[PDB]
Amino acid sequence: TWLAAXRWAAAKXP
Structure with a gap:
């Protein structure tokens, strides 16, 4: 996500 x-x-996992 x-x-x-x-x-x-910002990026964070899924």
Whole structure:
């Protein structure tokens, strides 16, 4: 997955 929050985004596992 990915932790997309606004104009940002981080990666995390699935």
